[PDB]
Amino acid sequence: CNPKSVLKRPVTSEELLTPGAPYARKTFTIVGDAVGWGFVVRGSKPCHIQAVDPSGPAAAAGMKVCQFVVSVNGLNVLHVDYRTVNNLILTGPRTIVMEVMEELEC
Amino acid sequence: WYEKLHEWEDALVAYDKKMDTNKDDPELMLGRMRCLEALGEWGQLHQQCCEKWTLVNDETQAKMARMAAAAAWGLGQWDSMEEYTCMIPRDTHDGAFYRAVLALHQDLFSLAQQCIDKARDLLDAELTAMAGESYSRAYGAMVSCHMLSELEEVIQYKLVPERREIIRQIWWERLQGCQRIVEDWQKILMVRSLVVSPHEDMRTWLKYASLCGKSGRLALAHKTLVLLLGVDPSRQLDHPLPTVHPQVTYAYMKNMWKSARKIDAFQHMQHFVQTMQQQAQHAIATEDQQHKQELHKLMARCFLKLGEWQLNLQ
Amino acid sequence: AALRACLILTTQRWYRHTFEEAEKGFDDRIHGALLILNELVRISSMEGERLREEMEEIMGFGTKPRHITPFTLVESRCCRDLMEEKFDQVCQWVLKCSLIQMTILNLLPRLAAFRPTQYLQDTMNHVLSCVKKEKERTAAFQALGLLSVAVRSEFKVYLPRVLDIIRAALPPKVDATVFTCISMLARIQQDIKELLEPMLAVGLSPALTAVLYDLSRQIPQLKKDIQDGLLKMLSLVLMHGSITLALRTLGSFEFELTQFVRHCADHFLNSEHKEIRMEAARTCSRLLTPSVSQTAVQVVADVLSKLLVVGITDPDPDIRYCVLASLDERFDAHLAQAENLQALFVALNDQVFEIRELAICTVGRLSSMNPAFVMPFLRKMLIQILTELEHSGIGRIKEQSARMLGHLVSNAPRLIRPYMEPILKALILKLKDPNPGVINNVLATIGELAQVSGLEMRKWVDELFIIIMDMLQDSSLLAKRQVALWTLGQLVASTGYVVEPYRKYPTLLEVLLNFLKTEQNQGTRREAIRVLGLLGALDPYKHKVNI
Ligand SMILES: O=P(O)(O)O[C@H]1[C@H](OP(=O)(O)O)[C@@H](OP(=O)(O)O)[C@H](OP(=O)(O)O)[C@@H](OP(=O)(O)O)[C@H]1OP(=O)(O)O
């Protein structure tokens, strides 16, 4: 009851590591706002984006829900817990450099 | 129609007939959430919002986001409140208040200050229009800015430990002037929970529990008493009531008399007054300044109830 | 320009009329026709305006707050037709029309982004002809970069003409536009690897440094290579106005530097220019980032010594002001040296208040760390602050002394907590003097004095509400009420007066509500709301009882 989950794919860690897949990597830099960025990551191994505020700054600069991240502000976070990534982004600067898997409608 | 009268107990049963008999458009389910939130039953609201959070329209869940966040806050599940918070519109007073209290939980003092300032300007437009008619009309917004100033004191509470003896003294005297409304006290007291546990100050919660029973629902007033004790006396009747916290158990025995038990309460009252006399004596340490006088004051109330109740019974 | 301003206001808050009027001239009237279309295109499509603004132009959510806070459509439908008409005019009026050419370049940037490849190739070819033409090289420089912004495939191979043009022109030498074109077209990673060499000989200008700085942060293709050229040029610059710009480059952002700091204490001691000494203080403080091994501990205490001497004996306060401003709270780990104290002690007795105001704040944290000599000295200074309040009957002198008091308490609250009596009693008598400048400073100081003495300033609130209330209610003078409103809510969040004042003063609620509509300043309105929250949310019935 407590968790909801969004993405249909159960696990995509191994497929993400493999070079052969429809996804094309993209790096997104998000600037802070007066009330927050407005994105949540709740993926255990891949740390996929859980939800994005449609009116938030993240939604303006792409950052769709169906995405996966591997590195934040330079540091590679491809294999860590979601809670640890949340600690890293908060302790970092207001502007966050993020990499989005951005699956090509697959 | 029942919602417009601030009468929620009969409003919920009305929606049950229109929903249980036949499922309909997602407008009746949203109506129940506005009723469960007012009543204060976070257990039933949380399971409905979480289950329905997926199979609803994107615009539909915008209205549901604010009510779902309150249920998670009441249950203390901060792991899921974050997901509900990021969907409330950010250009509204409620959209910044709920993401300001979220910064306090994760210890982001700088981010929280901007949100508090951001929420004041949004509430400014709503307050000036209502204040132009009369003060009574402009009261639902004044209680909102009252809660905004409480968040600032929460930041001060978490920073300087030397002031955690007068912060929980303004909160008491400031609440006395507020209107005695169950809904108003439910929101304010929920704000005063990120730092101070209910077991840290029973003085404020006992007054809130009495208000719910006296003018509202007895069920809500009963669950707020077992929370302070830590155990539910209703489960086992043969066992005696807890001896510690004499003030808390005194109010519990009055609750039994009011609702259904005019005989079990009298039996427990006799055992309570009997044990306090032994507790009053056999005390080598002397605390006649405060403790002894306070203990004796409670004895007079306990004995007065014995005389009144026995005449009613016999 | 006048029409664009009117159109911008209408768009922010006539489309058919604008399109019809432009079509009349489309069917002397060359620059004007394009100017109207460019304004409409910019208003309709503002995506390309960000690139133009960037070309013209070129910390933390988890920090604990300070303890003592001091007082603060139709156009889109007619797009292909307009683009087709614009292309014909550019191709036809290539060299026979400079008024038309000047407007053509402006229209081209808007058309490229709005209408994205025959058109792109023709526009680049027209810009290429105007690249070597007169009065069009600067305008055409951003034209190539605009095409790359709309689509990277359009300038995938045609962008190299800009690099080829600047390949030999930059080393040979109008240099401001050359750097702008590279920055605009930058937003693959191998072109800038060797093209930076021609830019080195272009010249030492702020645009070149700003463009290079933006490229490194946005696109760090080769950070080491970018830092190799930037650091090498700066080192040889000081080996012999031009030098002043080089010092700013190192102090702009972080680099990857102990040889510079040792020689950094030579320019202001030898160069007679006043302008260079202004930046000399700032570049020294920011270059001391690595601050357990006795290899840098001694030298860092040496480079700090030079700034202290200059900051007290310089002929003009402007050089002295930036010396102490650079030495912020971060440098508290190196200002504890006894010999360094003498430079700071003299700064209190200085000719100008701008240095004394910062000096007393700086020594406030220094006094708490080194009270051996600061505490006896400040006793005499504090008395003179109060002495000028009463002995001398001048309103200008009293304002100066009160302001310095606020800095001392706001930086060393612990020392002033038990010493409220000599200050609070003097300030209260000051407020009842039988000059608006003094009022705005004593009220700010009192608000700061109400935070340190928590629950201690209890016997003065009764006589302090009357003074503040008269400054708000029945205020005969429309002075600055923000200070009074801010301190009114600052002495009730600590003292604890919440619901009681609503009864002794049955006007506070009414006057606070009136400030919502009368006042228009955003900061003032957000403070009246906070005072309402701090006081409470008393029920409407009790308001009726209080009348
Ligand atoms: O309504 P009752 O059952 O008769 O109880 C009342 C009530 O107490 P509760 O808040 O616990 O309900 C009064 O409080 P309020 O009406 O202000 O809410 C309280 O008076 P104080 O607040 O002044 O203490 C009074 O106490 P007392 O008997 O000392 O006058 C007490 O009466 P009982 O203790 O006799 O039930």
XYZ file of C-alpha atoms in Angstrom, chain C residues 23-537:
515
model
C 2.205 43.616 -45.964
C 1.522 47.086 -47.392
C 5.242 47.876 -47.501
C 6.221 44.378 -48.629
C 4.255 44.666 -51.885
C 14.046 53.782 -48.532
C 11.416 51.238 -47.435
C 13.925 48.453 -46.809
C 15.340 48.885 -43.307
C 11.975 50.007 -41.937
C 10.123 47.005 -43.358
C 12.586 44.554 -41.800
C 12.645 46.433 -38.480
C 8.876 46.056 -38.060
C 9.046 42.370 -39.012
C 11.976 41.771 -36.646
C 10.071 43.314 -33.729
C 7.018 41.167 -34.494
C 9.182 38.049 -34.869
C 10.963 38.725 -31.570
C 7.659 39.275 -29.751
C 6.065 36.200 -31.335
C 9.206 34.062 -30.884
C 11.437 34.931 -27.919
C 13.479 31.707 -28.054
C 16.311 33.375 -29.974
C 16.359 36.369 -27.628
C 18.214 34.313 -25.005
C 21.174 33.805 -27.349
C 21.353 37.539 -28.083
C 21.249 38.358 -24.364
C 24.021 35.844 -23.649
C 26.198 37.293 -26.419
C 25.686 40.848 -25.150
C 26.322 39.822 -21.535
C 29.470 37.881 -22.462
C 25.282 28.910 -1.692
C 23.337 25.961 -0.309
C 19.911 24.756 0.817
C 21.243 23.229 4.045
C 22.958 26.170 5.750
C 21.904 27.073 9.283
C 20.643 30.674 9.566
C 22.548 33.209 11.628
C 21.561 33.502 15.281
C 21.132 37.298 15.282
C 19.566 38.469 12.026
C 20.125 42.200 11.383
C 17.535 44.438 9.777
C 17.383 44.198 5.989
C -1.910 32.442 -34.166
C -2.047 35.002 -36.975
C 1.705 35.622 -36.749
C 2.450 31.886 -36.771
C 0.177 31.338 -39.780
C 2.029 33.983 -41.823
C 5.477 32.557 -41.077
C 6.420 30.554 -44.180
C 5.257 33.374 -46.466
C 7.315 35.913 -44.509
C 10.352 33.611 -44.569
C 10.000 33.099 -48.328
C 9.672 36.851 -48.905
C 12.678 37.586 -46.679
C 14.857 35.087 -48.560
C 14.042 36.696 -51.918
C 14.938 40.181 -50.661
C 18.274 39.007 -49.236
C 19.200 37.165 -52.441
C 18.166 40.074 -54.678
C 19.385 42.976 -52.509
C 22.761 41.384 -51.829
C 25.102 44.294 -52.604
C 22.944 47.050 -54.161
C 21.004 47.838 -50.967
C 23.969 49.572 -46.142
C 20.615 50.436 -44.575
C 19.015 47.269 -45.963
C 22.068 45.150 -45.109
C 22.052 46.284 -41.470
C 18.391 45.309 -41.063
C 18.863 42.085 -43.050
C 21.288 40.656 -40.480
C 18.858 41.332 -37.624
C 15.976 39.735 -39.542
C 18.090 36.685 -40.398
C 18.650 35.602 -36.750
C 14.899 35.657 -36.089
C 14.052 33.774 -39.291
C 16.670 31.060 -38.728
C 15.276 30.052 -35.330
C 11.603 30.465 -36.257
C 11.895 28.805 -39.694
C 14.464 25.943 -39.691
C 18.097 23.083 -46.018
C 18.076 25.512 -48.942
C 17.066 28.453 -46.736
C 19.806 27.744 -44.182
C 22.492 27.390 -46.863
C 21.365 30.570 -48.635
C 21.316 32.534 -45.369
C 24.841 31.365 -44.525
C 26.025 32.226 -48.043
C 24.504 35.705 -47.741
C 26.139 36.085 -44.322
C 29.410 34.820 -45.814
C 29.311 37.600 -48.416
C 28.583 40.123 -45.650
C 31.255 38.561 -43.408
C 34.002 40.306 -45.396
C 31.804 43.316 -46.217
C 31.864 46.698 -44.492
C 29.706 47.343 -41.407
C 28.447 43.739 -41.482
C 31.238 41.513 -40.101
C 30.126 41.983 -36.488
C 26.450 41.423 -37.323
C 27.178 38.359 -39.472
C 29.383 36.901 -36.719
C 26.353 36.016 -34.587
C 24.375 34.961 -37.673
C 26.397 31.754 -38.047
C 26.053 30.974 -34.342
C 22.281 31.436 -34.493
C 21.987 28.720 -37.151
C 23.891 26.235 -34.979
C 21.518 26.978 -32.089
C 18.426 26.059 -34.117
C 19.897 22.800 -35.463
C 23.318 21.223 -34.965
C 22.989 19.418 -38.311
C 22.566 22.704 -40.201
C 25.955 23.920 -38.918
C 27.508 20.441 -38.769
C 29.991 21.255 -41.542
C 29.139 24.836 -42.597
C 30.139 26.231 -39.178
C 33.788 25.519 -40.081
C 33.781 28.592 -42.341
C 33.672 30.750 -39.202
C 36.615 28.825 -37.741
C 38.471 29.048 -41.063
C 37.815 32.799 -41.263
C 39.125 33.313 -37.715
C 41.951 30.802 -38.244
C 44.298 33.343 -39.850
C 42.504 36.613 -39.039
C 42.785 36.252 -35.255
C 46.572 35.611 -35.202
C 47.026 38.514 -37.635
C 45.336 40.935 -35.217
C 37.248 44.309 -34.202
C 38.395 41.489 -31.921
C 35.269 41.697 -29.738
C 33.036 40.285 -32.484
C 35.496 37.483 -33.297
C 35.221 36.000 -29.799
C 31.430 36.425 -29.761
C 31.001 34.299 -32.896
C 32.993 31.411 -31.404
C 30.994 31.489 -28.161
C 27.664 31.655 -30.010
C 28.579 28.751 -32.307
C 30.100 26.682 -29.482
C 26.671 25.643 -28.184
C 32.434 19.251 -32.140
C 34.732 18.921 -29.121
C 37.919 18.748 -31.226
C 37.578 22.063 -33.086
C 38.250 24.104 -29.926
C 41.306 21.987 -29.061
C 43.615 23.902 -31.420
C 41.455 26.910 -32.366
C 42.141 28.537 -28.981
C 45.671 29.358 -30.167
C 44.461 32.068 -32.602
C 42.259 33.509 -29.847
C 45.324 33.906 -27.615
C 46.843 36.444 -30.026
C 43.481 38.180 -30.573
C 43.962 40.334 -27.486
C 43.412 40.676 -23.751
C 39.770 41.721 -23.430
C 37.012 40.873 -20.935
C 34.901 39.355 -23.724
C 37.630 36.833 -24.562
C 37.933 35.759 -20.920
C 34.157 35.672 -20.407
C 33.620 33.586 -23.551
C 36.419 31.188 -22.584
C 35.052 30.866 -19.041
C 31.570 30.044 -20.351
C 32.942 27.405 -22.735
C 34.853 25.599 -19.975
C 31.854 25.388 -17.635
C 29.229 24.585 -20.277
C 31.359 22.277 -22.443
C 34.431 20.924 -20.581
C 35.760 18.980 -23.557
C 39.407 19.385 -22.472
C 39.556 21.060 -19.063
C 43.314 20.511 -18.762
C 43.945 21.971 -22.223
C 41.658 24.923 -21.459
C 43.440 25.472 -18.139
C 46.840 25.058 -19.819
C 46.430 28.066 -22.106
C 44.678 30.220 -19.507
C 47.310 29.640 -16.814
C 50.312 29.990 -19.137
C 49.205 33.392 -20.450
C 48.500 34.765 -16.963
C 51.928 33.790 -15.607
C 53.865 35.648 -18.311
C 51.563 38.692 -18.124
C 52.920 39.682 -14.699
C 56.518 38.827 -15.662
C 56.910 42.347 -17.097
C 45.805 48.371 -17.621
C 46.653 45.089 -19.321
C 48.016 43.628 -16.075
C 44.847 44.592 -14.179
C 42.685 42.413 -16.436
C 45.016 39.427 -15.996
C 44.651 39.588 -12.207
C 40.853 39.498 -12.527
C 40.973 36.338 -14.663
C 42.703 34.326 -11.931
C 40.283 35.696 -9.331
C 37.179 35.037 -11.434
C 36.812 31.271 -10.942
C 38.837 28.443 -9.435
C 42.061 27.285 -11.083
C 44.591 24.475 -10.631
C 49.436 28.330 -7.535
C 51.875 29.153 -4.737
C 54.229 31.015 -7.094
C 51.685 33.774 -7.775
C 50.843 34.563 -4.142
C 54.483 35.240 -3.217
C 54.791 37.804 -6.027
C 51.198 39.016 -5.544
C 52.429 41.423 -2.827
C 54.424 43.619 -5.234
C 52.029 45.551 -7.495
C 50.259 47.621 -4.837
C 53.586 48.368 -3.114
C 55.225 49.664 -6.312
C 52.550 50.699 -8.832
C 51.291 54.241 -8.240
C 47.991 53.563 -10.033
C 45.007 53.657 -7.684
C 42.830 51.431 -9.890
C 45.182 48.434 -9.776
C 45.369 48.493 -5.965
C 41.579 48.074 -5.751
C 41.735 44.591 -7.289
C 45.017 43.735 -5.535
C 43.285 43.172 -2.189
C 40.527 41.001 -3.671
C 42.808 38.693 -5.667
C 44.969 37.902 -2.622
C 42.115 36.702 -0.403
C 40.488 34.433 -2.996
C 43.802 32.814 -4.013
C 44.448 31.331 -0.532
C 42.063 28.384 -0.953
C 44.415 25.672 0.468
C 43.863 26.739 4.081
C 48.674 20.510 8.851
C 52.103 20.587 7.194
C 54.739 23.241 7.922
C 55.180 24.080 4.244
C 52.264 26.475 3.712
C 51.380 27.566 7.267
C 54.219 30.097 7.474
C 53.765 31.580 3.991
C 49.995 32.053 4.327
C 50.550 34.151 7.461
C 53.065 36.210 5.460
C 50.860 37.065 2.470
C 48.118 38.153 4.884
C 50.434 40.681 6.558
C 50.777 42.910 3.482
C 47.034 43.530 3.116
C 46.648 44.598 6.754
C 49.292 47.330 6.461
C 47.805 48.711 3.232
C 44.277 48.713 4.672
C 45.104 51.289 7.360
C 47.641 53.717 5.816
C 46.369 53.999 2.233
C 45.655 57.617 1.191
C 42.134 56.838 -0.010
C 39.518 54.765 1.862
C 38.476 52.984 -1.350
C 41.592 50.797 -1.303
C 41.239 50.284 2.453
C 37.541 49.387 2.200
C 38.119 46.404 -0.097
C 40.965 45.080 2.077
C 38.692 44.478 5.071
C 35.723 43.441 2.917
C 37.750 40.583 1.426
C 38.761 39.424 4.928
C 35.353 37.971 5.748
C 34.349 35.453 8.430
C 36.178 32.721 6.485
C 39.594 34.171 7.395
C 38.890 33.914 11.140
C 41.423 31.058 11.204
C 44.287 33.426 10.288
C 43.340 36.739 11.960
C 44.139 35.468 15.480
C 47.842 36.372 15.275
C 48.854 38.929 17.898
C 50.968 41.006 15.502
C 48.060 41.170 13.041
C 45.784 42.565 15.771
C 47.541 45.948 15.844
C 46.450 46.630 12.259
C 42.818 45.939 13.181
C 42.905 47.869 16.473
C 43.829 51.167 14.794
C 40.986 50.725 12.282
C 38.432 51.478 15.016
C 39.813 55.022 15.378
C 39.692 55.842 11.676
C 38.778 58.999 9.783
C 35.830 57.499 7.873
C 32.876 55.548 9.244
C 32.837 53.067 6.346
C 36.004 51.436 7.694
C 35.039 51.699 11.372
C 31.656 50.075 10.707
C 33.295 46.984 9.212
C 36.181 47.017 11.705
C 33.921 46.800 14.765
C 32.013 43.916 13.171
C 35.276 42.148 12.301
C 36.690 42.502 15.821
C 33.368 41.321 17.259
C 34.207 37.719 16.420
C 37.867 38.486 17.158
C 37.004 39.729 20.656
C 35.255 36.454 21.516
C 38.386 34.577 20.395
C 41.072 36.982 21.704
C 39.602 38.967 24.627
C 42.986 39.573 26.302
C 43.372 43.092 24.874
C 40.184 43.797 22.902
C 37.882 43.763 25.942
C 39.690 46.511 27.941
C 39.926 48.707 24.833
C 36.235 48.448 23.914
C 35.163 49.661 27.370
C 36.434 53.174 26.623
C 34.928 53.171 23.122
C 31.500 52.083 24.384
C 31.375 54.960 26.885
C 32.200 57.494 24.161
C 29.312 56.053 22.127
C 26.910 56.889 24.960
C 28.737 60.116 25.862
C 28.036 61.742 22.486
C 24.342 60.820 22.770
C 23.689 63.165 25.714
C 26.633 65.546 26.189
C 26.539 66.780 22.576
C 23.184 68.012 21.301
C 23.686 67.127 17.631
C 21.340 64.769 15.806
C 23.955 63.695 13.260
C 26.449 62.476 15.874
C 23.894 60.359 17.749
C 22.914 58.467 14.589
C 26.531 57.482 13.904
C 27.125 56.027 17.375
C 23.910 53.985 17.534
C 24.626 52.186 14.251
C 28.004 50.922 15.485
C 26.316 49.459 18.574
C 24.139 47.146 16.485
C 27.123 45.558 14.749
C 28.832 44.763 18.060
C 25.833 43.026 19.649
C 24.834 41.201 16.450
C 28.307 39.610 16.260
C 29.107 38.956 19.957
C 25.734 38.292 21.627
C 27.176 36.508 24.672
C 29.076 39.527 26.012
C 26.081 41.880 25.688
C 23.500 39.534 27.251
C 24.092 40.557 30.917
C 24.957 44.168 29.964
C 21.512 45.203 28.719
C 21.099 47.802 31.483
C 23.637 50.416 30.226
C 22.205 50.177 26.686
C 18.454 49.605 27.046
C 17.974 52.383 29.608
C 19.886 54.888 27.465
C 17.948 53.969 24.314
C 14.560 54.253 26.046
C 15.334 57.798 27.201
C 16.530 58.585 23.667
C 13.147 57.626 22.192
C 11.381 60.153 24.465
C 13.489 63.180 23.527
C 11.285 66.339 23.587
C 15.610 64.151 13.129
C 14.310 60.912 11.589
C 17.822 59.541 11.039
C 18.442 58.517 14.651
C 15.076 56.751 14.980
C 15.727 54.267 12.164
C 18.941 53.103 13.878
C 17.871 52.827 17.527
C 14.799 50.787 16.559
C 16.975 48.428 14.513
C 19.398 48.119 17.434
C 16.572 47.459 19.914
C 15.232 44.687 17.690
C 18.680 43.102 17.730
C 18.887 43.591 21.505
C 15.580 41.724 21.899
C 17.001 38.506 20.408
C 20.045 38.132 22.671
C 18.125 38.765 25.918
C 15.517 36.036 25.604
C 12.832 36.338 28.312
C 15.075 38.929 30.029
C 13.638 42.047 28.346
C 10.338 41.607 30.176
C 10.041 44.757 32.317
C 10.540 47.153 29.376
C 7.964 45.772 26.914
C 5.119 47.531 28.741
C 6.740 50.937 28.180
C 8.095 49.949 24.743
C 4.745 49.158 23.103
C 3.559 52.735 23.689
C 6.551 54.217 21.854
C 6.228 51.832 18.903
C 2.427 52.042 18.690
C 2.506 55.844 18.458
C 4.945 55.498 15.546
C 2.390 53.336 13.693
C -1.031 54.465 14.943
C -1.847 58.152 14.399
C 1.517 58.621 12.666
C 1.557 62.315 11.772
C 4.726 61.777 9.702
C 4.739 59.225 6.869
C 8.252 58.056 7.717
C 9.709 54.555 7.314
C 7.413 52.282 9.330
C 9.177 49.107 8.162
C 11.733 49.388 10.977
C 9.014 49.893 13.597
C 6.927 47.021 12.222
C 9.943 44.701 12.021
C 11.059 45.385 15.596
C 7.476 45.182 16.887
C 7.300 41.553 15.777
C 10.890 40.886 16.840
C 10.394 41.746 20.524
C 7.220 39.641 20.789
C 8.682 36.397 19.389
C 11.220 36.362 22.255
C 9.472 38.116 25.155
C 6.285 36.092 24.676
C 3.623 38.820 24.444
C 1.046 37.199 22.161
C -2.610 37.446 23.207
C -2.344 39.903 26.093
C -1.463 42.983 23.940
C -4.737 42.545 22.026
C -6.596 43.612 25.198
C -4.479 46.464 26.592
C -4.306 47.986 23.078
C -7.706 47.489 21.366
C -6.379 48.972 18.116
C -3.404 46.771 17.158
C -5.521 44.301 15.182
C -7.336 47.065 13.288
C -4.203 48.996 12.305
C -2.330 45.879 11.146
C -5.173 44.935 8.794
C -5.222 48.451 7.323
C -1.538 48.153 6.378
C -2.397 45.365 3.917
C -4.216 47.719 1.530
C -2.484 51.058 2.171
C 1.098 49.796 1.942
C 2.449 48.671 -1.428
C 6.032 47.589 -0.677
C 6.344 43.807 -0.873
C 8.769 43.559 2.045
C 6.557 45.619 4.349
C 3.458 43.539 3.575
C 5.226 40.244 4.309
C 6.238 41.652 7.708
C 2.746 42.753 8.756
C 1.508 39.218 8.054
C 4.261 37.751 10.242
C 3.340 40.080 13.116
C -0.265 38.890 12.807
C 0.851 35.264 13.020
C 3.166 35.854 15.978
C 0.500 37.731 17.950
C -2.049 34.979 17.367
C -5.348 34.156 15.678
